[PDB]
Amino acid sequence: CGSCYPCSC
Ligand SMILES: [Cu+2]
C-alpha cells in the first residue's frame, strides 16, 4: 500500500 496495507491486493 492502499486499501489492504501492507499488501498485495
Ligand atoms: Cu499494499
PDB file of N, CA, C and O and ligand atoms in Angstrom, unseen atoms left out:
ATOM      1  N   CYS A   1       0.789  -1.142   0.000  1.00  0.00           N
ATOM      2  CA  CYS A   1       0.000   0.000   0.000  1.00  0.00           C
ATOM      3  C   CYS A   1       0.788   1.140   0.000  1.00  0.00           C
ATOM      4  O   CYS A   1       0.596   2.348   0.029  1.00  0.00           O
ATOM      5  N   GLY A   2      -2.106   1.058  -0.107  1.00  0.00           N
ATOM      6  CA  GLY A   2      -3.505   1.090  -0.437  1.00  0.00           C
ATOM      7  C   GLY A   2      -4.428   0.530   0.701  1.00  0.00           C
ATOM      8  O   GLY A   2      -4.199   0.614   1.891  1.00  0.00           O
ATOM      9  N   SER A   3      -5.523  -0.001   0.166  1.00  0.00           N
ATOM     10  CA  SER A   3      -6.663  -0.421   0.971  1.00  0.00           C
ATOM     11  C   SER A   3      -6.429  -1.656   1.821  1.00  0.00           C
ATOM     12  O   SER A   3      -7.123  -1.896   2.831  1.00  0.00           O
ATOM     13  N   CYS A   4      -5.433  -2.410   1.480  1.00  0.00           N
ATOM     14  CA  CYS A   4      -5.037  -3.614   2.191  1.00  0.00           C
ATOM     15  C   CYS A   4      -3.634  -3.513   2.802  1.00  0.00           C
ATOM     16  O   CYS A   4      -2.964  -4.520   2.997  1.00  0.00           O
ATOM     17  N   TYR A   5      -3.218  -2.286   3.096  1.00  0.00           N
ATOM     18  CA  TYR A   5      -1.885  -2.031   3.581  1.00  0.00           C
ATOM     19  C   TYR A   5      -1.600  -2.915   4.781  1.00  0.00           C
ATOM     20  O   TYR A   5      -2.414  -2.950   5.726  1.00  0.00           O
ATOM     21  N   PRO A   6      -0.513  -3.630   4.827  1.00  0.00           N
ATOM     22  CA  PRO A   6       0.507  -3.707   3.653  1.00  0.00           C
ATOM     23  C   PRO A   6       0.044  -4.644   2.646  1.00  0.00           C
ATOM     24  N   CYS A   7      -0.110  -4.355   1.337  1.00  0.00           N
ATOM     25  CA  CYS A   7      -0.426  -5.547   0.709  1.00  0.00           C
ATOM     26  C   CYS A   7      -0.563  -6.571   1.811  1.00  0.00           C
ATOM     27  O   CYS A   7      -0.891  -7.788   1.689  1.00  0.00           O
ATOM     28  N   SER A   8      -0.827  -7.005  -1.066  1.00  0.00           N
ATOM     29  CA  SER A   8      -0.746  -7.456  -2.438  1.00  0.00           C
ATOM     30  C   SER A   8      -2.031  -7.309  -3.230  1.00  0.00           C
ATOM     31  O   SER A   8      -2.077  -7.725  -4.383  1.00  0.00           O
ATOM     32  N   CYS A   9      -3.087  -6.729  -2.630  1.00  0.00           N
ATOM     33  CA  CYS A   9      -4.308  -6.559  -3.378  1.00  0.00           C
ATOM     34  C   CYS A   9      -4.120  -5.567  -4.556  1.00  0.00           C
ATOM     35  O   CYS A   9      -5.027  -5.651  -5.442  1.00  0.00           O
TER      36      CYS A   9
HETATM   37 CU    CU B   1      -0.180  -2.866  -0.014  1.00  0.00          CU
END
